[PDB]
């Protein structure tokens, strides 16, 4: 067998089958005589690229496979890579190689210091010494961004290896399972049950690696057994809770002191699956007040290594959360009473306040969406405002890095043929990966684009106005037709000027065979 | 308080008390009132301060704490974080750094780059941003060397942030517990056990990570239940097993080849605590023959993504080996047979075959003596005739270092006061490390050392023997009087030129109250 | 032809024809065969394997080749390449890699992530993509080592490529010449003539690129005419002019405000050859006093980019000096009066001060004898004692690292057979690379080594007592016999108590026709 041959039958055996890319000749020889049982989906930039296959495997929970050119192509992905990173999301990524022969000289499309490029994004980033080491290597990046903490790996490969004869021993290589699904020891397991038994007012902060686990449903069972309060960890890459549950209380602020004062009074804090905490805003204070202990599970070491406080425990998250679950005792505090609704803020006949949007789209949109944001301004009231009962219901770029939310949702909707995808995004932030529309066109993946238009950078000239920074640059995005955009890229388009305009433009796009972009006229901040 | 008062709390909080060290200007800010409850321990060069801390650390089953002086000292250090690397030793590597006010103008004793100084050979490798950041990077620290899997991790102190005032939120620090003792979830090791159960010829093969949790007695009571022979993965660290058990059939050869025929015939091959494999020898041939199957429990996700064949489980190895070892059935099969002793090779009145020294000395030392090998050509020779029956008995250089035993021993036998250490060291390793001589004396660690003087490299001079590869050069080490090196670093000196003064050297040197070194006229490979 | 004698050609057709090494089996397919035109010295440690090739690369002006061990004998010479970093030494490192088929899975003597393991301090490091590309990869390592700024670099090789079949056109590297020798165009190097014959009382900054380039007579030329006072730049690894010429100053001490102060009154200083300015101390205030303006000539552009005043001119230390000595013209004013010579201190019939070695070194050594200082403690007195007459006459450390000099001392005495080396090295230094001394006795190198010996790591000890830093632990270095080390290691030994004992042991050693160590005791400080 062939290097190619044996390397496609490993991923296949592996559970792998559509390929995400943007092709160059360093790629031919491994895409040539593409399999038939295989798909491969185009983009034409690589941010698109790892954005769609980022938002495949986060859906999915599966490893996504992508391949690149060279150094330009792995290096226009690299922001969408900061992401990745951050939402623990295992991609495969390869990139082509010049032949070994004119590695030397550095021939144009040579990519130098291959396995350098991609750091300090990837937990492990290779290129191999011979053609017959390739399965091997793939066999490597396979299970490490499978294996927890789930992220992205890197393997660069010179073209002429696939032609070259595979090892025949690589076939020990195919049905190869390996497992993380890890939980603390009995004794110690035990110790933990105990304290969380017998606090006298507990809270729990749950973050993207629940949802990542499908530990969102375990979770509800812990939170009803102990009546506590439940809270999402700040910065939040995913939902991992029912928005509507009693329990439910938001997003916590991503404060230093906000944290602790929220926190204050509550004896025992249960984390799990999140950073603790992925802060933003420089709120100094407390880490946590007097009589708040911290108990934090997480899949990361790096995590754990990290906390400014608080213990640790590092374990798989879902067989954590199901072990919890199923061993605290029932308390006999009441449960928590559930968050009012939020309220109708005031609502003329011109440009629409988000407020207005959230509820509009709650109002219309199918129990089982899924959201994608991207509207940087307004991530508070839309986290207030969407009744996201189910897991898998949000998704926001997990390092801060804008450009993920539009690609994103079209891997996600090619995830969930069954859930309608519903991305909310900036004016501003659909411009960075905006030709990803065309993959949606191409491919008839039908996942609705709502772009909220109010002119600026909102988030910036927020935090400008924040600390009375005058004169400052850059802040304002005028004259981008979204609708000819659309067009341009094949999608079609509609635009909401009023409320009116919005409700009808929803209930067109809901009906729709295909994707769609709105563009709505929204407030200016 | 100051950053120097906080950093040295944290640490004593966190269990470490020693600090081993070669000294320079850009650490004696941290040096200076240096506290009564810690103890320093001077070493004359940087390779034997970080090889008498990895004997340490691998003894004593916890941390050690290391302090080099910049870029010149940690690069001295270097090839002793090679074998810690491969070993999973827990170091905390730290390096002074200059004041951050010249650090831009490299004035004499920057350390440019210096996070990528131990590069690749550290888990977790970090200069702080600012001066109140140094208890929190040291936290990071100790937590990245001490989480699974284990390992050697490097921080960069300005010599400036010590008298600076630390973060009053520093003392959350203090008292984080963070713990990895995972094991696989109920379901899963149900079925692994009964994979276990139903086998009709398991074998069981051991790596270092089973001495590191001491799991060594609950492999016994595994390989009892499943009557099952044991061999040790081969360029075994440590010791994992009691190597007069029953099962116990040594120390594998580090070959593909050797290693699928030894196996062949049986069906389900377990590795606990171990890369599958540390091959030396290129020996090709199957990784497995029709018939084997293999499942891998690991401590560190790189070894189960490179492993070419079999299952894996990353989970503790403590956790895991207790979990099996008390969830397996009793077979009833017959308990495996002994393996016979060695033979004694004829010995005349001269130079001493290895083997006669290998058999005095298990004639003599203690039934709790601690063996260090880096007698290179008679490894084989050394685990056939040494009965230990104790965990924490054995140490070989991991990645194959030369330049480990020696100092290794010394923090071997500070870390076990009661069980004496005997280091079996070629005339040609001897070399690289000697200087650590003097820190057994200056400290009377009453380590023993025995030089196996062949004058050559002998494991070399075999290896090319073996490829038929003529005039190479450098093979030979003539002209050492160690005894002479011995007395210059204070210690006392004996020589054994025959069978009669290796006895009467080794009786002399077991009833010493300080360190002694033994000259082993050897012969000529 | 095959990769090995394609790639020992391309040495020897580049003017290579010794390899400084310490083997190991990754190696034995590079080493076998050895052509009888090439020597191989043989070192029993990494670090004095690097010391000895970068000793005699400096005093030979041309590259050392430097064949290592894998990742752990690479690592042991990283803190040498520290120090050869900062001299700028033309190092070719090579290392040998395991065969290509297990690199994947990292067996045992695998160098992992090869590259960049001595990185940051290397100027290139690679392992070849195939066996045929490696005489193309030693190619770029001869020429990244050779061009300025010169520096070492590092290429790992796989042990199975030295067999395979050779390109045929690796026959176009064999002659390859390639020049950096360059100086500032004429039209701007007209401007600087004019501003030195302008300046109304320059001074001239001399470091250790001059030495290298053999500049010092050029420098000297310069400073005749320009009659100008001459300093050598702080932390000096080598010395770049005479140092009884009627314009030398000494060396500049290290700090920032007393070279200021130093440089008040003087229009022009031009620095040549040295960092703007390798400081120790922290020693703030003004970089340059009003009225004095510094241009520097450096081969290194990262020390023009790093200088924190004057204007850079990146070029070739030899060109340049060449062309400015040619070109100034002479000024009438008067030439600079010799400093005097250093007063005579006190002694008694007991130690030794160092002043009174240093008076006695210079009133017995030869007038072409060669120096190297690793008595940390007496440097400035060092510089003021030894009567210094030609170029390549003093070697000092250039990073700081210590285990440098006697190393060092054995390659520069290679370089120079007709010239006597004398290394002057603490007895906290002497341990760092103690195994190199039984090179010197091997192969005859007759350098002579004196051992200053005060017990204690004195720099250190004034360093903390400037900051008043009590209780600093691991000053002392009691209890070392450097007679008995000697005597190890097959050198002649002598001891010097007092004077008379000085003088009779250099009259010994000046004599003798080995290597020579003398043991003497100097006054604690
Ligand atoms: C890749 C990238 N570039 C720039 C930024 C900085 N940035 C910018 C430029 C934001 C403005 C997004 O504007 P928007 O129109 O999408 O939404 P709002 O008006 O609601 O802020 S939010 C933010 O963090 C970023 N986060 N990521
Ligand atoms: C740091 C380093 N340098 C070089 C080597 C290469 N090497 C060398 C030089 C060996 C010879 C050791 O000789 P010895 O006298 O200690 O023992 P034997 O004579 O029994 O081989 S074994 C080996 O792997 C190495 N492994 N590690
Ligand atoms: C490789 C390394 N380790 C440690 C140091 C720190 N250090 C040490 C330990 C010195 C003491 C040298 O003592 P010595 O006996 O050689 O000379 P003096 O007594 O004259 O200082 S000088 C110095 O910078 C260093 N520079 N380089
Ligand atoms: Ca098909
Ligand atoms: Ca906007
Ligand atoms: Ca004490
Ligand atoms: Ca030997
Ligand atoms: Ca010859
Ligand atoms: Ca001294
Ligand atoms: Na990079
Ligand atoms: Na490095």
Redesign the pocket.
């Given at each position: 067998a062939s290097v190619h041959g044996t390397t496609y039958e490993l991923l296949r055996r592996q559970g792998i089958d559509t390929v995400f890319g943007n092709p160059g000749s360093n790629e031919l020889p491994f895409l040539k005589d593409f399999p038939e049982d295989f798909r491969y989906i185009l983009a034409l930039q690589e941010a698109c690229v790892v954005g769609i296959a980022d938002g495949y495997a986060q859906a999915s929970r599966k490893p996504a496979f992508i391949n690149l050119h060279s150094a330009a192509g792995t290096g226009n992905a690299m922001?969408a890579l900061s992401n990745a990173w951050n939402s623990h999301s295992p991609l495969i990524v390869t990139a082509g190689q010049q032949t070994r022969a004119m590695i030397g000289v550095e021939a144009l499309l040579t990519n130098v210091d291959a396995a350098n490029l991609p750091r300090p994004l990837v937990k492990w980033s290779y290129e191999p010494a011979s053609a017959a080491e390739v399965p091997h290597a793939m066999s490597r990046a396979i299970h490490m961004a499978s294996m927890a903490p789930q992220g992205p790996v890197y393997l660069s490969v010179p073209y002429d290896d696939w032609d070259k004869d595979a090892d025949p021993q690589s076939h020990h290589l195919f049905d190869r399972h390996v497992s993380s699904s890890v939980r603390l020891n009995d004794q110690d397991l035990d110790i933990l049950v105990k304290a969380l038994n017998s606090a006298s007012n507990p809270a729990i902060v749950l973050g993207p690696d629940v949802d990542a686990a499908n530990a969102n449903a375990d979770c509800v069972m812990l939170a009803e057994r102990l009546k506590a309060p439940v809270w999402v960890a700040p910065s939040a890459p995913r939902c991992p809770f029912p928005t509507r549950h009693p329990c439910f209380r938001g997003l916590m602020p991503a404060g230093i002191a906000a944290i602790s004062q929220l926190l204050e009074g509550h004896d025992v804090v249960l984390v799990i699956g999140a950073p603790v905490f992925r802060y933003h805003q420089y709120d100094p204070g407390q880490y946590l007040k007097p009589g708040t202990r911290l108990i934090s599970v997480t899949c990361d070491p790096l995590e754990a290594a990290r906390a400014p406080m608080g213990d640790a425990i590092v374990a798989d998250i879902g067989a954590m959360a199901s072990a919890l679950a199923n061993l605290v005792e029932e308390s006999s505090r009441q449960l928590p009473t559930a968050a009012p609704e939020p309220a109708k803020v005031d609502q003329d006949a011109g440009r629409l306040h988000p407020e207005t949007v959230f509820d509009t789209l709650n109002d219309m949109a199918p129990e089982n969406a899924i959201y994608l944001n991207?509207?940087?301004?307004?991530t508070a009231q839309m986290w207030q405002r969407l009744n996201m009962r189910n897991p898998g219901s949000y998704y926001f770029c997990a390092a801060?890095?804008?450009?993920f939310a539009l690609p994103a949702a079209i891997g996600v909707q090619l995830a969930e043929p069954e859930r309608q995808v519903i991305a909310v995004?900036?004016?501003?932030?659909?411009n960075?990966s905006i030709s990803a529309l065309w993959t949606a066109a191409q491919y008839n993946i039908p996942t609705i684009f709502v772009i909220?238009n109010?002119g600026?950078?909102?988030?910036?000239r927020w935090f400008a106005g924040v600390l009375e920074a005058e004169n400052v640059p850059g802040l304002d995005?005028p004259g981008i037709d979204f609708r000819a955009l659309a067009k341009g890229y094949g999608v079609q388009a509609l635009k909401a000027d009023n409320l009116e305009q919005l409700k009808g433009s929803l209930q067109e796009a809901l009906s729709a065979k295909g994707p769609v972009l709105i563009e709505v006229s929204t407030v200016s901040?």
């Amino acid at each position: 067998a062939s290097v190619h041959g044996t390397t496609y039958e490993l991923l296949r055996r592996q559970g792998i089958d559509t390929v995400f890319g943007n092709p160059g000749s360093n790629e031919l020889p491994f895409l040539k005589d593409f399999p038939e049982d295989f798909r491969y989906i185009l983009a034409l930039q690589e941010a698109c690229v790892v954005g769609i296959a980022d938002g495949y495997a986060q859906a999915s929970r599966k490893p996504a496979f992508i391949n690149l050119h060279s150094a330009a192509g792995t290096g226009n992905a690299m922001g969408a890579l900061s992401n990745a990173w951050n939402s623990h999301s295992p991609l495969i990524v390869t990139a082509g190689q010049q032949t070994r022969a004119m590695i030397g000289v550095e021939a144009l499309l040579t990519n130098v210091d291959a396995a350098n490029l991609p750091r300090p994004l990837v937990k492990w980033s290779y290129e191999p010494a011979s053609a017959a080491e390739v399965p091997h290597a793939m066999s490597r990046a396979i299970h490490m961004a499978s294996m927890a903490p789930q992220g992205p790996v890197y393997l660069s490969v010179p073209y002429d290896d696939w032609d070259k004869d595979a090892d025949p021993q690589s076939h020990h290589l195919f049905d190869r399972h390996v497992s993380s699904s890890v939980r603390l020891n009995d004794q110690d397991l035990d110790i933990l049950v105990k304290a969380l038994n017998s606090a006298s007012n507990p809270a729990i902060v749950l973050g993207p690696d629940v949802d990542a686990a499908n530990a969102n449903a375990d979770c509800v069972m812990l939170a009803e057994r102990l009546k506590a309060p439940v809270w999402v960890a700040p910065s939040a890459p995913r939902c991992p809770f029912p928005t509507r549950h009693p329990c439910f209380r938001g997003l916590m602020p991503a404060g230093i002191a906000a944290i602790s004062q929220l926190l204050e009074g509550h004896d025992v804090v249960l984390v799990i699956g999140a950073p603790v905490f992925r802060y933003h805003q420089y709120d100094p204070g407390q880490y946590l007040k007097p009589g708040t202990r911290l108990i934090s599970v997480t899949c990361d070491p790096l995590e754990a290594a990290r906390a400014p406080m608080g213990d640790a425990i590092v374990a798989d998250i879902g067989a954590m959360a199901s072990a919890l679950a199923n061993l605290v005792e029932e308390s006999s505090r009441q449960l928590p009473t559930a968050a009012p609704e939020p309220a109708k803020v005031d609502q003329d006949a011109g440009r629409l306040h988000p407020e207005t949007v959230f509820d509009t789209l709650n109002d219309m949109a199918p129990e089982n969406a899924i959201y994608l944001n991207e509207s940087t301004s307004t991530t508070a009231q839309m986290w207030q405002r969407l009744n996201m009962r189910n897991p898998g219901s949000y998704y926001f770029c997990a390092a801060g890095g804008i450009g993920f939310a539009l690609p994103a949702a079209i891997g996600v909707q090619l995830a969930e043929p069954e859930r309608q995808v519903i991305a909310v995004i900036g004016d501003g932030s659909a411009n960075y990966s905006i030709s990803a529309l065309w993959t949606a066109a191409q491919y008839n993946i039908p996942t609705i684009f709502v772009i909220m238009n109010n002119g600026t950078y909102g988030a910036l000239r927020w935090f400008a106005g924040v600390l009375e920074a005058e004169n400052v640059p850059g802040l304002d995005v005028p004259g981008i037709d979204f609708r000819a955009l659309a067009k341009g890229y094949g999608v079609q388009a509609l635009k909401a000027d009023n409320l009116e305009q919005l409700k009808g433009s929803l209930q067109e796009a809901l009906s729709a065979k295909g994707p769609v972009l709105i563009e709505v006229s929204t407030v200016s901040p």
